[PDB]
Amino acid sequence: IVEGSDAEIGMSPWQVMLFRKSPQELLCGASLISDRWVLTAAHCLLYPPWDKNFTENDLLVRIGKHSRTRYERNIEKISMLEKIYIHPRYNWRENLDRDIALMKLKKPVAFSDYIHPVCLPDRETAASLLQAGYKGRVTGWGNLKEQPSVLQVVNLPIVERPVCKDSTRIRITDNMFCAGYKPDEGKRGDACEGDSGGPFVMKSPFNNRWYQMGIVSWGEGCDRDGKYGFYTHVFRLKKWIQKVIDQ
């Protein structure tokens, strides 16, 4: 995260570190959506251009963390993957269309003060909150510019689709949205490398709950003027989500 702040303790209790065994390193962000299910970007597990193809046994999930590098004894939970599932129409050749994967954990995790699932959106919450100018929040442990001691946080506005498209020569799909401040605006900030697969969340003003509207997908640089971060449209893929979950 570039131009973010240090997270508060328990601010993002659904935040999940994707952790590589050897080398023992940060791969991606991710999110906890129930006791046995973790949501991430497909490109965290499978991205042939940067030589990436992970199997279950290469990877761990670390839940409940705040420190990037410490082993947070009595606080974090490190879990094992039973199964990875990449969306079958995931487009890694072109534009990262349908950049989404689910990970089933080998056993359920116990919730705690630091470990709690985020909500997935329903149609109406999507239709009501996913509007240009409305802000969501991104968190993670990725680089501070194009590395943090602790989880970082930034609040970013959703950007009008035409602007997203005119910022880039990539072909945007309806399964993605973009966010970020415009050049003229007073504020800046962005995700960066190591934040990807993490959650873009919004807080409903109707029921006071946090909804995962986005997954951190890609950007051209980190926090460049006239560029924006691209996010997987979670609601749009939500039928795939509850397919694999009830099956």
Binding site: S5, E8, I9, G10, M11, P13, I33, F111, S112, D113, Y114, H116, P117, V118, C119, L120, L129, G133, Y134, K135, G136, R137, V153, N155, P157, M202, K203, S204, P205, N208, R209, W210, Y211
Partner: peptide, 26 residues
């Protein structure tokens, strides 16, 4: 069920330091 309600904020009715920036944008 209990999703999106954080043990140290909403479940104790405490606000975080920047959530108001979000709500004001809506």
């Amino acid at each position: 069920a209990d999703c999106g309600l954080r043990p140290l904020f909403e479940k104790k009715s405490l606000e975080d330091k920047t959530e108001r920036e979000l709500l004001e944008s809506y």
